[PDB]
């Protein structure tokens, strides 16, 4: 549709260069003015749809992104934490996670007014020697004091004649109970 106006525009604007009668030029220019007015209406109507199209696409892109993130928050957040703990230079975090990756892991931790209480599962003698040093437990970068020790349905290890006699003879795992020496 717009091509029609341009063809008339090119011819009639060039007609000024020839000896066309002025009265015809006035009519010729009047037609050209009408054509230009129609073109402007085409531009306004067409572009008003074009800008609406841009807004719809951008709006739905944002909506698609938002609904996508909320569907996987819990699993993603765990990766976010363990990716952050790497950035820290401290070696304490490596020691704890290295132990957890191994066979030694903590059981329920009990807050208390007097002192926090730990429970640790030691599957083998090597695991027991990992954390026990000088008769105390070295976990979470602090000295934990042992109170009692628990067997597999028993407490016979309590006498602490355990370093060699118990490893060969009795069953495992071996569980410890400790309290924090220093209160936070």
């Amino acid at each position: 549709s717009y091509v029609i106006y341009e063809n008339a525009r090119q011819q009639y604007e060039d007609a000024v260069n020839n000896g066309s009668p002025p009265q015809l030029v006035k009519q010729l220019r009047h037609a050209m003015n009408v054509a230009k007015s129609e073109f402007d209406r085409e531009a306004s109507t067409q572009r008003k749809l074009d800008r609406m199209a841009e807004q719809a696409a951008a709006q739905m892109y944002k909506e698609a992104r938002a609904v996508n993130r909320k569907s996987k928050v819990v699993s993603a957040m765990h990766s976010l934490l363990f990716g952050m703990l790497r950035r820290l230079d401290m070696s304490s975090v490596d020691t704890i996670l290295n132990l957890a990756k191994d066979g030694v892991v903590p059981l329920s931790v009990i807050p208390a007014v007097s002192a926090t209480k730990l429970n640790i599962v030691t599957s083998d003698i090597d695991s027991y020697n990992r954390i026990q040093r000088e008769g105390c437990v070295h976990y979470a970068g602090t000295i934990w004091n042992i109170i009692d020790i628990k067997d597999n349905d028993g407490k016979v290890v309590h006498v602490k004649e355990v370093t060699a006699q118990n490893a060969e003879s009795l069953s495992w795992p071996l569980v410890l109970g400790c309290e924090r020496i220093v209160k936070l």
């Binding site: 199209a53 841009e54 696409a57 951008a58 739905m60 892109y61 944002k62 698609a64 992104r65 938002a66 993130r69 909320k70 928050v73 976010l80």
Partner: protein, 921 residues
């Protein structure tokens, strides 16, 4: 020497140790003196008395005053007539010879070291340095041992709760003094002596002395005057809880020997009247136990002040709504039938109907929100976690609420590190975080109403301050407006309990036609409608660990309250160039105009600010009521006298004292304020100016008028004292003269509880105006909270602007031929606002571009700052916004193949757009 010391010892005693020998001892003591040349309440040095210590007694000083023989004989005539009563210390009269002259002597036996005025003055002019008088009096009276003062913070009410226990031991001293004042005044009337009695005539023991200015008259028909005696002591007798001995119920609710029917009594009108005639017999003015019988606004303040003092003797369970039997659809009920206020007394409804049926929405709406029916039909409760009284609990049981942490914005944080922020150089670091809270965050924060206490004002001085503070608000207009003409900005907000269970405020504002809103409003002008607030925890970024609660007032309270205040409140925000700033913008050069207007006209200027510790909790009941009286004083033609009273009660019953619902239990609130009120930001402002003016009046009276030379100030002091303690009506001519004196030397800028002051420095040093040492005094006995000097600031030069106002520092820069101020925030606030977000979807910035725009607008002023690190704060936000826009455009192109044009949105990462918002005019 020795011969004179012989007779002073008396004819029936011995063991006197001379403190200064035969010569008089110089000492500083407080006085309340009105005279042809001086009118002061400060302290003066005296020379005419010799003081001797008695060794046998705990505290007994023989003080002998020597004067001209005629004066000595004058006192003897007065003493001989009064001595037979039980309130005069033992006097002995004699004369002694000198080498060339004769002079008289008056000897008093067993007078304590400090008069009553010293105790009152030492508590109403207080600062943690040079406090030896108050410390001394506590030891000698026996309130606390000297080891107590070893604690470095013994004086702080909000950090040493035991202090209120120590002062109560002084209650016996204050109460004992008054019962001896009435006994003395009776002796005056019978014996026929005309004079003015004041505090400095009385010992801590209660005996009177030094009555040399009294004059004789015919027996009977004597005239004692005690306006200044009781008025000056009023804050002390409420701070020290002197009426504890008069408690009506002396049994514990948890005791097994208690009785049930005792809880029912509510009418204590006779009890209060009996006390008034027992202690304040010669107070003179009338006293109406129920404030509904009063005549003026000044009388309602006058009587309500006494009721607050006498409320300490009434049980805590007697207050609250008074309910009555009622019938609905033929089945019985319990419905409100009045109210019992701590201040205003008992008020009865004028409209209650006992039979109703086919309920309309109006009858149905107010029945549902009225606590009477819900509280009565639920089990009782005893909550030991809070001191506040509380009896109710939902049939579903109680619960608890926790507060979760914030969400970490990883992408933005990595951006800051790449730009070089948060380097270990320690230039800038995070300071604002999202804090978590345990399960009992709400109730343990409602427990902080412990700090609210029953303060009593010295009414003789709160009359003038009420006049001056009102002059600040005479510019604005006010009145009632029809429901057709109100404006509400947010219809999508909670309607309170229990209406929030069905829909938000929008539903009720369209269900109620205009005629039904005006029917309800007109009903409230003749009845009292109690309602419940709900405690909800604010979830926002903060720099302090303590949790903060905000109450949501029921809809029927705000729907009616703002229709009564809207016209006045909207006038405060439209008026520009006044003390209250609530309506001024900080953009478009608004900040410069505010400061340049404040500083103009003050000679030799200085700049200060101040802080109220725990304003929401410690705000006294009396000064919150006055804030409601001042804002309603504009209703002069649209409402009669009784219509304004029942609109005042509706504010007290729905805001001040309330039934608070939190976590499934209903508690009875003791007082203070709640942020959810319709007049929060404006009721605080009136209270703020009340303290600022009350600090000026308190100190101006205390400057020694015998050395003042600024005749305008000297005359003002004398007129001020005369207008307070020796006049029945305030002449408004003086108030306009005094109010026109503050505006020249003590200009103010107030906005809710935050404000700044520019004050003449020369006058303050001498004491003609307020000072930080004066704000400590007014808060201690008007708010009983200690204002630590580290929480307030002073700026001796104006070129730097205020140190901190509205949590934004100020800087001055020179540009072209003009110089102007600019506000900039704390840099850590802008950075921390982006790293930590309160919603998970906000972790992805591309979804919300406009959050960092409108956050860089606040950060632009930093671009002018000197420190290069502060400069980066603004420019990093421009790069961040540039990164987001270019990411979204490319993302949409790839995903949907339509390219967004960047020309339209290219103005948001160029500083020219932001600079236009801080350009004058």
């Amino acid at each position: 020497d020795m011969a004179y010391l012989n007779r002073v010892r008396g004819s029936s005693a011995a063991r006197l140790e001379p403190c200064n020998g035969t010569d008089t001892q110089h000492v500083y003591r407080a006085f309340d003196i009105y005279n042809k040349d001086v009118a002061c309440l400060g302290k003066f040095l005296k020379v005419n008395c010799v003081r001797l210590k008695n060794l046998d007694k705990h505290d007994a000083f023989y003080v002998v005053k020597r004067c001209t023989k005629s004066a000595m004989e004058h006192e003897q005539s007065i003493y001989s007539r009064l001595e037979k009563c039980g309130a005069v210390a033992e006097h002995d009269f004699f004369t002694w010879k000198d080498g060339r002259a004769i002079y008289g002597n008056v000897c008093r036996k067993d007078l304590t070291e400090y008069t009553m005025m010293d105790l009152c003055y030492a508590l109403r002019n207080f600062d943690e340095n040079n406090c030896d008088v108050l410390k001394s009096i506590l030891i000698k009276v026996g309130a606390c041992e000297e080891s107590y003062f070893n604690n470095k913070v013994w004086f702080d009410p909000v950090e040493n709760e035991d202090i209120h226990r120590v002062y109560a031991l002084l209650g016996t001293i204050v109460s004992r003094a008054m019962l001896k004042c009435v006994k003395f005044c009776d002796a005056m009337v019978e014996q026929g002596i005309v004079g003015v009695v004041t505090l400095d005539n009385q010992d801590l023991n209660g005996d009177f002395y030094d009555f040399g200015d009294f004059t004789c008259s015919i027996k009977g028909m004597g005239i004692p005057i005690c306006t200044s005696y009781y008025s000056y002591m009023m804050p002390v007798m409420g701070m020290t809880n002197c009426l504890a001995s008069e408690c009506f119920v002396k049994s514990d609710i948890f005791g097994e020997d208690f009785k049930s029917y005792d809880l029912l009594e509510y009418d204590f009108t006779e009890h209060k009247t009996a006390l008034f005639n027992k202690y304040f017999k010669y107070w003179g003015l009338q006293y109406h136990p129920n404030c509904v019988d009063c005549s003026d606004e000044q009388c309602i303040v006058h009587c309500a002040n006494f009721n607050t003092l006498f409320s300490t003797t009434i049980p805590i369970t007697a207050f609250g709504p008074l309910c009555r039997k009622c019938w609905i659809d033929g089945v019985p009920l319990v419905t409100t039938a009045g109210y019992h206020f701590k201040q205003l007394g008992i008020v009865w409804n004028n409209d209650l109907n006992l039979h109703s049926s086919r309920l309309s929405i109006n009858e149905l709406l107010q029945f549902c929100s009225d606590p009477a029916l819900l509280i009565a039909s639920s089990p009782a409760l005893v909550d030991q976690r809070t001191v506040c009284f509380s009896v109710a609990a939902l049939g579903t049981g109680m619960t608890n609420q926790t507060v979760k942490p914030g969400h970490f914005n990883k992408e933005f944080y990595d951006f800051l590190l790449e730009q070089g922020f948060f380097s270990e150089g320690s230039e800038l670091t995070l300071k604002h975080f999202f804090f978590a809270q345990k399960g009992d965050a709400a109730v343990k924060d409602f427990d902080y109403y412990r700090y609210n206490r029953p303060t009593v004002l010295d009414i003789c001085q709160a009359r003038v301050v009420y006049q001056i503070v009102q002059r600040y608000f005479d510019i604005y207009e006010g009145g009632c407006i029809t429901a057709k003409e109100v404006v509400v900005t947010n219809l999508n907000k909670s309607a309170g309990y229990p209406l929030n269970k069905f829909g938000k405020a929008g539903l009720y504002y369209e269900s109620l036609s205009y005629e039904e809103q005006d029917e309800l409003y007109a009903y409230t002008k003749r009845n009292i409608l109690p309602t419940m607030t709900q405690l909800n925890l604010k979830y926002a970024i903060s720099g302090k660990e303590r949790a903060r609660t905000v109450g949501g007032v029921s809809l029927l309270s705000t729907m009616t309250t703002r229709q009564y205040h809207q016209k006045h409140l909207k006038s405060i925000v439209n008026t520009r160039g006044a003390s209250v700033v609530i309506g001024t913008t900080k953009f478009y050069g608004g900040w410069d105009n505010m400061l340049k207007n404040l500083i103009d006209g003050v000679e030799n200027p200085c700049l200060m600010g101040w802080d109220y510790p725990k304003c929401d909790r410690a705000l006294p009941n009396m000064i919150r009521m006055i804030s409601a009286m001042i804002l309603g004083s504009k209703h002069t033609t649209c409402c009669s006298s009784t219509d304004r009273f029942f609109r005042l009660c509706n504010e007290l019953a729905q805001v001040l004292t309330e039934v608070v619902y939190s976590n499934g239990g209903f508690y009875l609130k003791p007082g203070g304020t709640t942020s959810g009120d319709a007049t929060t930001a404006y009721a605080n402002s009136v209270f703020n100016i009340f303290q600022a003016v009350s600090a000026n009046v308190n100190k101006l009276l205390s400057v020694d008028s015998n050395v003042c030379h600024n005749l305008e100030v000297k005359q003002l002091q004398r007129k001020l004292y005369e207008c307070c303690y020796r006049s029945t009506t305030v002449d408004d001519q003086f108030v306009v003269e005094y109010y026109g004196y503050l505006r020249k030397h003590f200009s103010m800028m107030i906005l809710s509880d935050d404000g700044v002051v520019c004050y003449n420095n020369d006058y303050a040093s001498l004491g003609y105006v307020a000072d930080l040492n004066a704000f400590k005094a007014v808060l201690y006995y008007q708010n009983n909270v200690f204002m630590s000097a580290s929480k307030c600031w002073i700026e001796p030069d104006i070129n730097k602007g205020p140190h901190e106002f509205c949590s934004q520092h100020t800087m001055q820069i020179v540009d072209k031929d003009g110089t102007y101020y600019l506000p900039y925030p704390d840099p850590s606030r802008i950075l921390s606002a982006g790293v930590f977000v309160d919603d998970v979807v906000k972790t992805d910035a591309v979804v919300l571009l406009e959050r960092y725009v409108s956050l860089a607008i606040d950060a632009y002023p930093l671009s002018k700052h000197e420190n290069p690190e502060y400069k980066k704060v603004f420019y990093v936000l421009l790069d961040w916004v540039k990164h987001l826009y270019k990411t979204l455009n490319a993302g949409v192109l790839e995903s949907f193949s339509v390219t967004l044009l960047e020309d339209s949105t290219a103005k948001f990462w160029d500083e020219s757009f932001y600079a236009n918002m801080y350009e004058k005019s």
